[PDB]
Write a protein that binds this ligand. Structure first.
Ligand SMILES: *Nc1ccc2c(C)cc(=O)oc2c1
Ligand SMILES: [Zn+2]
Lengths: 267, 4
């Protein structure tokens, strides 16, 4: 896979429909905890322990404490130069009649905070709820999401469960519902929204350039998307921190923090 | 518990 920025820029200059697949590394460069992989814990758990239907079924208070903490942490986090290069790209190309779409597994909305409008959040958002009774999905930026969670979700080991009764967890505010809300986030063992997948497929079918940023093209989620693109002969450029180009079959690989490489690549 |  080629390391030539100048060669990439030649493709970039001509591209009318860029797909940008954004993985966990873009959020990690902003200091966002992911609670996955080595060392990444909340209390004694990782996401695989808490982001599951069974965990929510058995201990919804503990799961809401976890998501409350992650919501509140975002008050001290900012998009990085990679988010900004991506948003600025969308804005500049959009005035030229050229499309940029960001397909992200990140749930922290830093792409939105950076100014990205064309965003497919395949794992949902920390700042959306879904009613487990009526199914309504709502934006929710309230700090705290409900009064009982104020000061809860502390991440330190040894912190006891808040054990909030379900009636005092976040409830649906649709007239005549009152159901228990969950985060509008894909959990382990759960299906992706098929409508989002349909939209993803449309973008991949039409794009003439694909970036994979902050993740590898041979693991989920990029492995679900990049092969479709490469099969049509569309260049795929990878921007990640692996010194190993874990792939060939993809045209480009640029090693380093996305905040270092993308401002140059997308200028 | 691991599977997305
Ligand atoms: N975790 C999960 C569930 C369902 C998926 C579909 C149907 C497609 C895909 O690309 O990724 C999925 C991931
Ligand atoms: Zn409801």
């Amino acid at each position: 896979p080629s390391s030539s920025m100048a060669d990439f820029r030649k493709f970039f200059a001509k591209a009318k429909h860029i797909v940008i697949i954004s993985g966990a590394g873009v959020s990690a460069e902003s200091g966002v905890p992911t609670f996955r992989g080595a060392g990444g814990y909340w209390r004694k758990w990782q996401a695989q322990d808490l982001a599951t239907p069974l965990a929510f079924a058995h201990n919804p208070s503990r799961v809401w404490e976890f998501y409350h903490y992650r919501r509140e942490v975002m008050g001290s986090k900012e998009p990085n130069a990679g988010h900004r290069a991506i948003a600025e790209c969308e804005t500049r190309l959009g005035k030229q009649g050229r499309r940029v779409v960001v397909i992200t597994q990140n749930i922290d909305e830093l792409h939105r905070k950076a100014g990205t409008k064309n965003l497919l959040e395949i794992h949902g958002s920390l700042f959306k709820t879904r009613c487990t009774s009526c199914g309504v999905v709502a934006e929710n930026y309230k700090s705290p999401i409900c009064p009982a969670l104020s000061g809860k979700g502390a991440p330190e080991p040894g912190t006891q469960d808040a054990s909030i009764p379900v009636e005092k967890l976040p409830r649906c505010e649709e007239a005549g519902c009152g159901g228990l809300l969950r985060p509008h986030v894909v959990w382990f063992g759960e299906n992706l929204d098929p409508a989002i997948l349909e939209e993803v497929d449309r973008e991949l079918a039409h794009c003439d350039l694909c970036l994979v940023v902050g993740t590898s093209s041979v693991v989920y989620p990029a492995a679900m998307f990049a092969p479709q693109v490469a099969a049509r002969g569309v260049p795929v450029a990878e921007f990640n921190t692996e010194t190993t180009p874990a792939t060939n079959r993809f045209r480009f690989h640029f090693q380093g923090p996305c905040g270092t490489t993308l401002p140059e690549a997308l200028a | 518990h691991f599977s997305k």
